Amino acid sequence: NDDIDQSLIIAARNIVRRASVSADPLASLLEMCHSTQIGGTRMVDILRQNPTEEQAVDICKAAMGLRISSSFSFGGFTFKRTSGSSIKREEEVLTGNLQTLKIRVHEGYEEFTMVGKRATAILRKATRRLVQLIVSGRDEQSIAEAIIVAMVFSQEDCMIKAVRGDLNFVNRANQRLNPMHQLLRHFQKDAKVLFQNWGIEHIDNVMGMVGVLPDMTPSTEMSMRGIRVSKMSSTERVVVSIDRFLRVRDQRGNVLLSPEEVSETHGTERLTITYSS
Ligand SMILES: O=C(O)[C@H]1[C@H]2CC[C@H](CC2)[C@@H]1Nc1nc(-c2n[nH]c3ncc(F)cc23)ncc1F
């Protein structure tokens, strides 16, 4: 039933936002999920039996020890590893404003699939290197957003040095964002410099694959390095941890979800959401 899911998501998102601004968001979130009711039934009972995988929903599921999708969310996009592997190595890099950031750099060749509300992509990358990106979204803006995420996700030096400012982004709870999100929010405010310094190259026009330029204009002759455009599976469930501030981590310690990665809501629920604590 799609009506339950639509309302569950709407409820989950509101709960995570309202909990995130608490002193102990995890406690606050557990209180809200126990008493809030969707269409009569208690929410806890829905999470236990509902198959929906969503950022806010999987946060709530994780909060009560339920298995969730191994995939992780970054910049709104759901990354699933199709091939390859990497390992973590806390490096320290230098931005284009001489600000130092301690970043978890991933070493190894990986293949991914990015999925978003308004764009998808296949992303090949390796140690601080974007090999290939085949984005395919709704329109210009939705596709640019997907490329910005890919560039920041790649951890390439040109992207790091493309920073032109001091990164002091905070969240609803007025806490500093972790490095990778600091970079992301900066290049979402304006990706002008990022796209210039990324670099262009000559492309060999193949069907479907169309190139794109730093101004977001196509070309069958030249495109940006590794980035192509186009037009148009199973789920592994795994145990996950959650801490005070609703940061969900897999066993290997990588942040799968956080309040920072939940979308905004439309708030036209088909079922009855009574928010009790
Ligand atoms: O590293 C983390 O703790 C999180 C942070 C928020 C989302 C992202 C990006 C940073 C990351 N989560 C995860 N990242 C990765 C990953 N694999 N290969 C990568 N290359 C660069 C990168 F940058 C992250 C990754 N694999 C599993 C994850 F679960």
Curated annotation (Swiss-Prot):
Shown residues in whole-protein numbering: 252 to 533 of 759
Function according to Swiss-Prot or TrEMBL: Plays an essential role in transcription initiation and cap-stealing mechanism, in which cellular capped pre-mRNAs are used to generate primers for viral transcription. Recognizes and binds the 7-methylguanosine-containing cap of the target pre-RNA which is subsequently cleaved after 10-13 nucleotides by the viral protein PA. Plays a role in the initiation of the viral genome replication and modulates the activity of the ribonucleoprotein (RNP) complex.
Localization terms from the record: Virion; Host nucleus; Host mitochondrion
Lineage: Viruses, Riboviria, Orthornavirae, Negarnaviricota, Polyploviricotina
Protein name: Polymerase basic protein 2
Stated family: Belongs to the influenza viruses PB2 family.
Subunit note: Influenza RNA polymerase is composed of three subunits: PB1, PB2 and PA. Interacts (via N-terminus) with PB1 (via C-terminus). Interacts with nucleoprotein NP (via N-terminus). Interacts (via N-terminus) with host MAVS (via N-terminus); this interaction inhibits host innate immune response.
Gene symbol of the encoding locus: PB2
